[PDB]
Amino acid sequence: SPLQEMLAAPSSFKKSHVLSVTQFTRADLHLLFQIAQEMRLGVQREGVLDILRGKVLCTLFYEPSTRTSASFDAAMQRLGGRTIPIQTSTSSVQKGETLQDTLRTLACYSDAIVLRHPDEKCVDVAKKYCPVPVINGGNGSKEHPTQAFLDLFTIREELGTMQGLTITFVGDLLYGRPVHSLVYLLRHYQVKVQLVSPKALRLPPAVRQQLVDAGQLLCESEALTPEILGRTDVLYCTRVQKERFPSLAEFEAVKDSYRIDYSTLKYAKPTTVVMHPLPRNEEVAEEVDFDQRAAYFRQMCYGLYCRMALLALVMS
Amino acid sequence: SPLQEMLAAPSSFKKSHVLSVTQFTRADLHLLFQIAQEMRLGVQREGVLDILRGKVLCTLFYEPSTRTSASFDAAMQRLGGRTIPIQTSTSSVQKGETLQDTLRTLACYSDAIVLRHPDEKCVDVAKKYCPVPVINGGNGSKEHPTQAFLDLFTIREELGTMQGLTITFVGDLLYGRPVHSLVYLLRHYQVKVQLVSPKALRLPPAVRQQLVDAGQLLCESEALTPEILGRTDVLYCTRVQKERFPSLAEFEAVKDSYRIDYSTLKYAKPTTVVMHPLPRNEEVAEEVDFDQRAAYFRQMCYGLYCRMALLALVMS
Amino acid sequence: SPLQEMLAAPSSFKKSHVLSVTQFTRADLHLLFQIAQEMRLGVQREGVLDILRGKVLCTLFYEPSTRTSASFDAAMQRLGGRTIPIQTSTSSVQKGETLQDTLRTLACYSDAIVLRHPDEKCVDVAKKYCPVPVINGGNGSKEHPTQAFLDLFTIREELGTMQGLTITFVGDLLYGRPVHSLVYLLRHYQVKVQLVSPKALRLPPAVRQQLVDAGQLLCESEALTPEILGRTDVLYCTRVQKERFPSLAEFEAVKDSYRIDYSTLKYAKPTTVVMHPLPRNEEVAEEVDFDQRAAYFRQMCYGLYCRMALLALVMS
């Protein structure tokens, strides 16, 4: 059984918290992705597999989510497992219950917990107190490891080899921490990176220095130019929010500058992959949603299979 | 296997969006109802069947619901399928995500979506963008096709043949669109229809003309008279809301006029079936809830089996 | 099959509403607890059992909950059953639907309902109208029978024989109705009870008289003294809320008086069991959470297996 053989191999994910991309190796991720491909084939054949039938996953989201909370629910159920989605707004959180009490409560009922919480330190709280694996679905928006895993998987699935690709990040590269996580995962590969942002929203110096240290920094630009677009293999977009500028007029100019529409794609390659972790506002125009190069819906689908692979490893 | 044979037959529901009663034929509905009866027998025997074990249903309600959202959850699970109920109030809808982005997101995880949304055009959005079947659970309250299906099923189950029945609609026949949908489904049958409403809440002219064209209009009345009641086989009630009248005094008089209580039933037939799509306020009095003719709880139960039949056809 | 044999025996829980501890006998609870132990062994072996595969449980919480709503969901799913958690804040309750209409609605879809509602009389509404078993998860905070069952189970599991134990209740013994329910369950056993509370929050006279009638009242004290602690086998704590005192200064003094921390445990026995139904505020200090005598997390876990035993009896 192809999947049974892969799931039997050693893995850093097994029985592990999944809190940071810094916990995992290139080899860890290659096995994850191999399993994800087999999960997709299994789902195509069977819909709901028989991998985690005796296991129960809690999801615990203190901040809004559609992709991350629903995809983990679907992934668990499509492994044959059971899910318990916790509605924090009507839980005893409303009576003052701390995060560490909530996690120890749910650990009595479930075999693992997916957590999204507004305090960056929630992952330290989880490590200290929670006696079952916790999967970080977002800690004060600092990290989101399974978003990073699925972003990298999307690139590999869409284009094949990483060698020689040029990846262009556009938008808010300061508060867009998915960019930072993906930069870390890219450190193993012979890629080149272009960074397009307002000066104010450039990468933090430590993340820029990671690209320099890996020999990957190709250019930083305030403009999304034809030349930058024409060499782009992956165009990875982030949302720019109004709070990032003192004036609405500057916010609107910046949005106009970075909006991906047909006037943008005309300068891209025929094979350029447009990605966005979502949700989006208007920074990728609706008019390109049926273009072959609009990959941000496929990206979500790749996320399902990546999360199936992850849950099976953590909880097998 | 009786059910397996029925589910193998051709059906307009298979792999279809379910957006309007106008999509489906009398023959479509007869097969649906035959399957619904077998679903009930299966549930009586087994509780949870093995029909949709590898399938996943998302429910996506932007407006309050008890019957429609819970019955679809229960129907799917009682087919052996899996459900993912999406809480819109804590989803990325709260971060601005459009309906079409939400539908394409959930289509990555699920095999069909039940949608209730306040924009009548949500069904056009679904048709344009959603790559899995969408079942309309209410579009700006304009249509609610599975409510219409279960309303018709209820009549057939309670009384048998449609031939010769007199159906009396009472309450708000202008904003009570379930009345309009049921009128459309009744166009095939030799029934007679009585319409009891304030003048202001009469049927729209196009719906009245449907009854005229079918030779079914028996009378329009502002009063729920003994004579109207005495010829009623089905008394189908809708909620009248305070916003429908400029003054509270007129609202209260209208409510008093149309309230179904024991003083009403004394004029009805011993076999009259009292229906209401629910929720109700006070327009059907609590005092008649244990009367044999109070069919609005049985109506909800018939809805479960109708929705089991529907989901099995759409997703088989 | 050990569990199959126990589940086949007669039980007052079978096909019963579970509304009050006064419905059930010592023999009823002993069978429940025997089954709970076997449920734990089953879950350890299999994760998800095959006991209630064809059954569906609705949960219906009008007030916040983490333990009770999640544990019943997990218990049902770990029996192999299906769950439908109803979000009241987005249900037709928001359109005015009464409790009795909501219960009769959900009874069309499910085989039993867990209810938590702010009206003490909700249990009478359920008995009158609901045609499937209802399990009281809290009725205007007056009773919470499965909390009482799991509290008693926790004592037995932690200490073994009830004979000769001294149980010390501390905090708000007037509004802390779990204390009153546990007092009722303790009436069969040769225990002694100490009551530590502000004068204002002493037991109601009828509950005090129950302890007197059973020969169990050892002392009432405003102070949590070394002498009281040194004879305590079970220290059962309740939350004291600010509304219980006219002034904040008195509230803070009372909290300081009754807070369980290391300075408290130094006077307790090495075998003292510290319990709390939860949620807690600060009345049990975080610093003792990893002490062997801190049993309030294990208490929640015992609750899962108790509720598995309960659901299997009610719905087998």
Author numbering:
A (entry chain A), B (entry chain A), C (entry chain A): 1938 to 2253
Manuscript text:
CAD is a 1.5 MDa hexameric protein with four enzymatic domains responsible for initiating de novo biosynthesis of pyrimidines nucleotides: glutaminase, carbamoyl phosphate synthetase, aspartate transcarbamoylase (ATC), and dihydroorotase. Moreover, in fungi, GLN, CPS, and ATC are fused into a CAD-like protein with an inactive DHO-like domain, and the DHO activity is encoded as an independent enzyme. The crystal structures of the ATC domains of human CAD and the CAD-like protein from the fungus Chaetomium thermophilum showed a dome-shaped homotrimer with three active sites between the subunits that are very similar to bacterial and plant ATCs. Here, we report the insertion by site-directed mutagenesis of two cysteine (Cys) residues in the ATC domain that favor the formation of disulfide bridges between subunits in the trimer.
So, for this study, we engineered a construct encoding only the ctATC domain (ctATC-WT; aa 1939–2253) fused to a removable N-terminal His6-maltose binding protein (MBP) tag and then introduced the mutations N2045C and R2238C (ctATC2Cys). Using these criteria, we selected residue N2045, in helix α3, and residue R2238, in helix α12. Indeed, similar ctATC2Cys crystals grown with CP showed extra electron density at the active site assigned to the bound substrate and residues S2029 and K2032 from the CP-loop, which was well-defined in this structure. The binding of CP to ctATC2Cys was as already described for ctATC-WT, including a small hinge closure of the protein subunit. The only important difference in the structures of ctATC2Cys that are free or bound to CP was the presence of the mutated Cys residues and the extra electron density between their side chains that demonstrates the formation of three disulfide bridges between subunits in the trimer. Thus, we conclude that the Cys and formation of the disulfide bridges do not alter the protein folding or oligomerization and do not interfere with the binding of CP. The high-resolution crystal structures of ctATC2Cys also indicate that the disulfide bridge does not alter protein folding and neither impedes the binding of CP nor the induced conformational changes. However, we could not grow crystals of ctATC2Cys in complex with PALA (N-phosphonoacetyl-L-aspartate), a transition state analog that induces a large conformational change of the Asp-domain that is required for the reaction. On the other hand, the activity assays with ctATC2Cys showed that the mutations to Cys increased the activity of the enzyme, making it two-fold faster than the ctATC-WT (v = 8.87 ± 1.06 mmoles·h−1·mg−1). Overall, these assays indicated that disulfide bond formation, rather than hampering protein activity, increases the specific activity, most likely by preventing dissociation of the active trimer at the high dilutions used for the assay.
